[PDB]
Design an enzyme around this catalytic site. Sequence first.
Site, PDB file in Angstrom:
ATOM      1  N   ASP A   1       0.833  -1.187   0.000  1.00 52.53           N
ATOM      2  CA  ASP A   1       0.000   0.000   0.000  1.00 52.53           C
ATOM      3  C   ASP A   1       0.870   1.239   0.000  1.00 52.53           C
ATOM      4  OD1 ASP A   1      -2.522   1.176  -0.130  1.00 52.53           O
ATOM      5  OD2 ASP A   1      -2.655   1.437   2.053  1.00 52.53           O
TER       6      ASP A   1
HETATM    7  N1  LIG Z   1     -10.991   1.116   0.444  1.00 50.01           N
HETATM    8  C1  LIG Z   1      -9.957   1.023   1.485  1.00 50.01           C
HETATM    9  C2  LIG Z   1      -8.709   1.763   0.990  1.00 50.01           C
HETATM   10  O1  LIG Z   1      -8.889   3.191   0.645  1.00 50.01           O
HETATM   11  C3  LIG Z   1      -7.719   3.850   0.089  1.00 50.01           C
HETATM   12  O2  LIG Z   1      -7.447   3.106  -1.098  1.00 50.01           O
HETATM   13  C4  LIG Z   1      -8.294   3.321  -2.258  1.00 50.01           C
HETATM   14  C5  LIG Z   1      -7.822   4.494  -3.133  1.00 50.01           C
HETATM   15  O3  LIG Z   1      -7.623   5.686  -2.340  1.00 50.01           O
HETATM   16  C6  LIG Z   1      -8.749   4.694  -4.366  1.00 50.01           C
HETATM   17  O4  LIG Z   1      -8.381   5.763  -5.238  1.00 50.01           O
HETATM   18  C7  LIG Z   1      -8.790   7.043  -4.777  1.00 50.01           C
HETATM   19  O5  LIG Z   1      -7.824   7.681  -3.911  1.00 50.01           O
HETATM   20  C8  LIG Z   1      -6.540   7.900  -4.517  1.00 50.01           C
HETATM   21  C9  LIG Z   1      -5.663   8.699  -3.541  1.00 50.01           C
HETATM   22  O6  LIG Z   1      -5.479   7.960  -2.340  1.00 50.01           O
HETATM   23  C10 LIG Z   1      -6.669   8.771  -5.739  1.00 50.01           C
HETATM   24  O7  LIG Z   1      -5.375   8.972  -6.309  1.00 50.01           O
HETATM   25  C11 LIG Z   1      -7.589   8.072  -6.738  1.00 50.01           C
HETATM   26  N2  LIG Z   1      -7.838   8.861  -7.957  1.00 50.01           N
HETATM   27  C12 LIG Z   1      -8.902   7.901  -6.040  1.00 50.01           C
HETATM   28  O8  LIG Z   1      -9.879   7.255  -6.873  1.00 50.01           O
HETATM   29  C13 LIG Z   1      -8.578   3.454  -5.202  1.00 50.01           C
HETATM   30  N3  LIG Z   1      -9.457   3.560  -6.385  1.00 50.01           N
HETATM   31  C14 LIG Z   1      -8.957   2.229  -4.384  1.00 50.01           C
HETATM   32  C15 LIG Z   1      -8.113   2.090  -3.151  1.00 50.01           C
HETATM   33  N4  LIG Z   1      -8.648   0.935  -2.423  1.00 50.01           N
HETATM   34  C16 LIG Z   1      -6.559   3.682   1.087  1.00 50.01           C
HETATM   35  O9  LIG Z   1      -5.323   4.153   0.538  1.00 50.01           O
HETATM   36  C17 LIG Z   1      -6.336   2.215   1.458  1.00 50.01           C
HETATM   37  O10 LIG Z   1      -5.298   2.092   2.425  1.00 50.01           O
HETATM   38  C18 LIG Z   1      -7.605   1.650   2.042  1.00 50.01           C
HETATM   39  O11 LIG Z   1      -7.391   0.295   2.392  1.00 50.01           O
END
Ligand SMILES: NC[C@H]1O[C@H](O[C@H]2[C@H](O)[C@@H](O[C@H]3O[C@H](CO)[C@@H](O)[C@H](N)[C@H]3O)[C@H](N)C[C@@H]2N)[C@H](O)[C@@H](O)[C@@H]1O
Length: 254
Positions: free
Chosen positions: A181
């Site tokens: 991550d």
């Molecule tokens: N659901 C639980 C998770 O939530 C975040 O993860 C999610 C991302 O954030 C998402 O993307 C979004 O956020 C990004 C910035 O963080 C942006 O760049 C991007 N354009 C955005 O669409 C991506 N699609 C899925 C990913 N699972 C945390 O990091 C993670 O630890 C935690 O477990």
Amino acid sequence: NLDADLYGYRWARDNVGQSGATIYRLYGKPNAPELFLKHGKGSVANDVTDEMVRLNWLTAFMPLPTIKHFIRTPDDAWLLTTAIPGKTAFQVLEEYPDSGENIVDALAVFLRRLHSIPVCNCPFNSDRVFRLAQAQSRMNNGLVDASDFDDERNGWPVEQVWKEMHKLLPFSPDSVVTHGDFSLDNLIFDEGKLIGCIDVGRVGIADRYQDLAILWNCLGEFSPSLQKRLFQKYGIDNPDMNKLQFHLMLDEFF
Ligand SMILES: NC[C@H]1O[C@H](O[C@H]2[C@H](O)[C@@H](O[C@H]3O[C@H](CO)[C@@H](O)[C@H](N)[C@H]3O)[C@H](N)C[C@@H]2N)[C@H](O)[C@@H](O)[C@@H]1O
Ligand SMILES: COc1cc2ncnc(Nc3cccc(Cl)c3)c2cc1OC
Ligand code: NA
């Protein structure tokens, strides 16, 4: 018990988007460092457990929070660690956008360092087939957060994302030691230096793009030029866009 380590601290309940586990921030104690206590029950306890062993394994190589104390019982895991003083890479980007070039330089060097850790040292597997299975078990239990898909997949049904993902497969695996991550929330800066990473629960052996993709996406929110440097400092000449796209699609499910 645990209490000797907890007299004096005051308590706050953080929400950092953390899947499942309740995170308490322990502070206020003079002559004593800030502490985090992660608490997981039921299935989430397994996850807190997974993070403890990885913290414990990985700290022999990288700079991590130290495990002051861990407790597992049949249904509850408790994890007490020291805090890494500083701001997230994301915050430092936001606060000082004329520093992005050094922050992305620093991120690449650090990520190179992690990946240079010889796999023969690493007891944890997290290859795609492991993750893919995990991803299915969250899809087929409707835990995947379709609200949070990347833009190019916004409003897609989960079963679609799943289907479009297996079209990019297969790719030649390469295997290194990965964070799992490597987002902008999980690397801690202080006084201009990168000084540690957090959230090591998915650490194991996997394709480097597991880490490169996730970080490259986070830098999508700042500059395509910053995204370019990440791959440039790390030393890849032509980003495997298929691989990038696969890992980003796999993160959607977590
Ligand atoms: N659901 C639980 C998770 O939530 C975040 O993860 C999610 C991302 O954030 C998402 O993307 C979004 O956020 C990004 C910035 O963080 C942006 O760049 C991007 N354009 C955005 O669409 C991506 N699609 C899925 C990913 N699972 C945390 O990091 C993670 O630890 C935690 O477990
Ligand atoms: C200052 O920013 C942080 C520093 C941190 N320093 C140390 N630990 C953090 N979080 C944490 C959460 C669960 C478990 C563990 Cl070991 C750490 C931190 C979380 C932060 O927010 C992203
Ligand atoms: Na260490």
